[PDB]
Amino acid sequence: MRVVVIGAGVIGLSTALCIHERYHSVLQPLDIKVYADRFTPLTTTDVAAGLWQPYLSDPNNPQEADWSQQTFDYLLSHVHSPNAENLGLFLISGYNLFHEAIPDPSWKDTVLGFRKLTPRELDMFPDYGYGWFHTSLILEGKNYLQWLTERLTERGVKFFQRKVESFEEVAREGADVIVNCTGVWAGALQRDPLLQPGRGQIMKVDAPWMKHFILTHDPERGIYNSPYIIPGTQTVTLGGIFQLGNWSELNNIQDHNTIWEGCCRLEPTLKNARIIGERTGFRPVRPQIRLEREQLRTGPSNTEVIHNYGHGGYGLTIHWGCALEAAKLFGRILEEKKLS
Amino acid sequence: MRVVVIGAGVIGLSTALCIHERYHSVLQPLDIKVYADRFTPLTTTDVAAGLWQPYLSDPNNPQEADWSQQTFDYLLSHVHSPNAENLGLFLISGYNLFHEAIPDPSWKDTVLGFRKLTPRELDMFPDYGYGWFHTSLILEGKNYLQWLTERLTERGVKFFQRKVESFEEVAREGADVIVNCTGVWAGALQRDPLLQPGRGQIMKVDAPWMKHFILTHDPERGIYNSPYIIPGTQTVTLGGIFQLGNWSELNNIQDHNTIWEGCCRLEPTLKNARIIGERTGFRPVRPQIRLEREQLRTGPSNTEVIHNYGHGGYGLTIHWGCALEAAKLFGRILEEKKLS
Ligand SMILES: Cc1cc2nc3c(=O)[nH]c(=O)nc-3n(C[C@H](O)[C@H](O)[C@H](O)COP(=O)(O)OP(=O)(O)OC[C@H]3O[C@@H](n4cnc5c(N)ncnc54)[C@H](O)[C@@H]3O)c2cc1C
Ligand SMILES: Cc1cc2nc3c(=O)[nH]c(=O)nc-3n(C[C@H](O)[C@H](O)[C@H](O)COP(=O)(O)OP(=O)(O)OC[C@H]3O[C@@H](n4cnc5c(N)ncnc54)[C@H](O)[C@@H]3O)c2cc1C
Ligand SMILES: Nc1ccccc1C(=O)O
Ligand SMILES: Nc1ccccc1C(=O)O
């Protein structure tokens, strides 16, 4: 059986590994291949800080809460392993800050030690009057992609750089299954009007003394459109931009100013930080993740497509649960083709 | 009025600053001079991680509980100030780990969001069944010493490098008040059987992924004699060594192995960290801090001595309350000389 995974971000790579880790034994030849037009450092995944944190509001598909819970348990059980440094994984605590009181998130029991802030803590942030504190995880995109690439490579998975024009292009050349993990670009392979870019711009700064994350939220400006500071392993991420439907992959000087002014006000110690660089990325925004089978009938025998895209601002937060689900659907295909 | 401060660690310098800040406007010839045998890089302060945390068990002098509170509030009010970086001051959270239930310490309401560890947090630590979590502060000794020196310079305090044989010697040269801040070496000037060296050895490691402090405690082995990991601004401090009476200012290979093996069991990710260096210091251990006046009968007249030493393993934690106390005592000497 021939498998073609399109996409080399966290979704593409993690899905390919799961599939292989779960079916390499039971299957005759299991030939897996990855096609992507962009790799390891030029993907959306690369731009992400890698904070584990779902949206505050409840998901449209309750199944998404499980996928996140599963990703958190997976990562947590590997956090104190000697290899964690290479994945870019570690424990991190921090603030969520609000102007007004708001209900507890549904994930409050997934994170470590969830609590509300205390008056003395709130005094440090004059502009905010309510908030949370908890311990979570960071999975740094760049590093995790590299780790996944190495794991897959020693599993004899082959990588090809190419832009796919259509599913048929791939089916025509021999694929039995196609796993579609194309992110914000999925619309180019099949009409999906529900799918939109949530453009975001972030800054890398050098401020080793920052040990906590600080996320702020403001309903007037919307999700991830208010200042945030996220320490990485070497560098610190500064953000605050979420523009729906903007496809411009270019650092905008005015957005740069919004980041810098917003973050310095939150944390004045940043005034003396060193700016290492800036990048722009596209959040695959969709009312819910498209994780489903589609059979592509092409005359005699047809080929199987598994869609896995539309993880918006929570692809790292949820990837692993999604990969198991994709692996689960792949399994259904095997028994249908009678090969359990 | 000629003042002589002996000692250029955290106690000497801070005390110097307060006295100068509090009385320069009400005294016409207020002359201050610091004498020290060792400066800014080679003091015990330089070797301290700079974590704010008192001893678990209550202080002998209850006044010490207050001096700690004052220091914490002082430092807290300065954390989000643009200059905090210079001082090496910042917020940090972390774990205190025990093998059994232990009572809440006095200082539970001083630190930010104190709470007990939850079962899931304890699962990350196999050898420990109880613990706390909270947010505290780091004052990097090396950096603060450097800051203090700059403040004193611009205020016109003069520094001299010389080892003082006796108070008598200093009184002879015309000093009206001697401020005695001589650390563990205080007994060389005046017999003090209660003061003993608490030798300590630390390791600087590069492990930027460490965002929390981890302190372990073992009742058998004693205070600061179990592994600990404390992230600094650029570097991570590994320790776990407290030996009473030992005067050897030399790194011990066995002590080294003890630090390293203990800290790797606790946090396996360190196995991959690169070692920068290693230093030894002496905690000025005393049943309680000596902070008091003593009239020294030297000739026809008599010179005032303010002692301020014996801060054990909480010199950084407590330095600011102490310095204000020493300034308070300085105020009395002034009313009595009729010059208030
Ligand atoms: C600024 C920012 C910060 C973020 N922070 C976080 C965070 O802290 N935590 C979190 O959980 N999530 C975060 N996210 C979201 C997360 O990064 C994304 O949801 C995640 O990267 C999506 O995975 P993926 O599908 O993008 O893989 P992708 O990045 O989409 O991989 C895409 C690959 O597929 C290829 N491709 C696309 N179309 C085709 C085609 N037609 N033919 C061939 N190849 C194609 C591309 O060349 C590319 O190489 C953040 C996003 C942004 C923008
Ligand atoms: C390994 C380690 C880690 C620590 N970590 C922390 C921590 O995380 N938090 C915390 O609060 N505390 C900590 N401490 C405790 C803290 O470091 C000390 O209590 C503090 O440094 C004491 O200040 P000081 O009196 O030592 O100044 P000192 O370091 O003692 O300065 C003394 C100066 O006086 C001079 N002097 C002495 N005698 C004479 C003389 N006769 N003539 C002339 N000059 C003389 C010396 O040359 C020296 O320069 C730690 C200690 C150690 C050892
Ligand atoms: N996904 C996120 C998680 C935390 C902070 C920012 C983002 C962001 O997408 O900008
Ligand atoms: N004063 C301290 C605070 C925290 C951890 C260790 C120490 C120490 O003296 O070794």
**Contacts with A267 from chain B: Cβ below 8 Å:** 80
Number of cross-chain residue pairs from A and B with Cβ atoms under 8 Å apart: 88
Q: Which two tokens stand for residue B181?
A: 């801040």
Residue in the structure block whose two tokens are 């320069």:
B24
Cβ neighbours for A303, distance < 8 A, ≥ 6 positions apart: A167, A171, A175, A176, A177, A178, A295, A296
Instruction: Give the separation between CA A189 and CA A174, rounded to whole angstroms.
Output: 18
How far A267 CA lies from chain B's nearest CA (Å)?
6
Of A80, A120, A272, the CB nearest to B124: A80
- Where would I find the beta strands (DSSP E) of B221-317? 228-231, 236-239, 243-244, 274-285, 290-296, 303-309
Q: Which two tokens stand for residue B129?
A: 């069944």
Cβ neighbours for A42, distance < 8 A, ≥ 6 positions apart: none
Residue in the structure block whose two tokens are 């937060």:
A317
DSSP single-letter state for residue B33: E
For residue B201, which atom of ligand 2 is closest to its CA? Answer: 1
Q: What residue segments make up the domains of chain A, in order of their start?
A: 1-88+140-195+286-340, 89-139+196-285
SS3 label, residue B285? strand
Tell if the CB–CB gap between B209 and A268 is shorter than 8 Å. no
DSSP single-letter state for residue A267: -
Instruction: Give the separation between CA A298 and CA A312, rounded to whole angstroms.
Output: 32
Tell if the CB–CB gap between A209 and B90 is shorter than 8 Å. yes
Instruction: Give the separation between CA A166 and CA A186, rounded to whole angstroms.
Output: 11
Of B76, B117, B209, the CB nearest to A85: B209
- Label residues B159-198 b or e (16+ Cβ within 10 Å = b): beeeebeebeebbeeebebbbbbbbbbbbebbeeeebbbb
Pocket test for ligand 4, best of B44, B47, B51, B96 (most atoms within 8 A of CB): B51
DSSP single-letter state for residue B183: G
Cβ neighbours for B23, distance < 8 A, ≥ 6 positions apart: B30, B327, B330, B331, B334
Instruction: Give the separation between CA B298 and CA A249, rounded to whole angstroms.
Output: 79
Tell if the CB–CB gap between B268 and A82 is shorter than 8 Å. yes
A268 and B80 Cβ atoms separated by less than 8 Å: yes
- Name the closest ligand to CA A202: 1
A58 and A28 Cβ atoms separated by less than 8 Å: no
Tell me the resolution in Å. Answer: 2.6
Burial group, residue A254, by CB count within 10 angstroms (0-12, 13-18, 19+):
exposed
Q: Which two tokens stand for residue A42?
A: 């030029």
What is the A85 CA–ligand 2 centroid distance (Å)? 35
Measured in residues, chain B has a length of 340
> B161 touching A, CB under 8 A?
no
Q: Which DSSP string corresponds to A230-243?
A: EE-SSSEEEE---E
Nearest-10 crossing angle of helices B141-154, B10-23: 30
> Is the distance from the beta carbon of residue A224 to the nearest atom of ligand 3 less than 6 Å?
yes
> A267 touching B, CB under 8 A?
yes
SS3 label, residue B236? strand
> Is the distance from the beta carbon of residue B213 to the nearest atom of ligand 4 less than 6 Å?
no
B309 and B181 Cβ atoms separated by less than 8 Å: yes
Say if residue A283 carries a ligand binding annotation.
yes
Closest CA to A73 of A326, A324, A336, A338: A324
H-helix or E-strand spanning residue A327? helix A315-336
Nearest-10 crossing angle of helices A63-77, A315-336: 110
Cβ neighbours for B201, distance < 8 A, ≥ 6 positions apart: B239, B241, B251, B252, B255, B256, B259, B278, B279, B280
Bridge partners, B116 (sequence order) = B132
Closest CA to A244 of A311, A284, A198: A198
For residue B200, which atom of ligand 4 is closest to its CA? Answer: 10
- Going by their DSSP bridges, the two strands A236-239 and A158-161 should be labelled as unpaired
Closest CA to A233 of A43, A52, A133, A89: A89
DSSP single-letter state for residue B164: -
> B155 touching A, CB under 8 A?
no
Let me know if the fold of B1-88+140-195+286-340 is the same as that of B89-139+196-285: no
SS3 label, residue B309? strand
> Is the distance from the beta carbon of residue B241 to the nearest atom of ligand 4 less than 6 Å?
no
> A295 touching B, CB under 8 A?
no
Spelled out in words, what is the top-level CATH class assigned to the domain A1-88+140-195+286-340?
alpha beta
Please give the backbone phi and psi of residue A116, each rounded to the nearest 5 degrees, phi first: -80, 155
Q: Which fold has domain A89-139+196-285?
A: D-Amino Acid Oxidase; Chain A, domain 2 (3.30.9)
Say if residue B8 carries a ligand binding annotation.
yes
B309 and B11 Cβ atoms separated by less than 8 Å: yes
Please give the backbone phi and psi of residue B82, each rounded to the nearest 5 degrees, phi first: -50, -25
How far from B276 is each of A179, B140, B330, CA to CA, in Å?
A: 47, 17, 42
Tell if the CB–CB gap between B82 and A269 is shorter than 8 Å. yes
How far from B279 is each of B48, B89, B202, B268, B276, CA to CA, in Å?
A: 10, 21, 6, 23, 11
Instruction: Give the separation between CA B51 and CA B239, rounded to whole angstroms.
Output: 13
Q: Which amino acid is at B114?
A: F
- Name the closest ligand to CA B138: 2
H-helix or E-strand spanning residue B98? strand B89-98
- Where would I find the beta strands (DSSP E) of chain A? 2-6, 31-36, 89-98, 112-116, 130-139, 158-161, 177-180, 196-206, 212-216, 228-231, 236-239, 243-244, 274-285, 290-296, 303-309
Of B82, B84, B121, the CB nearest to A113: B121
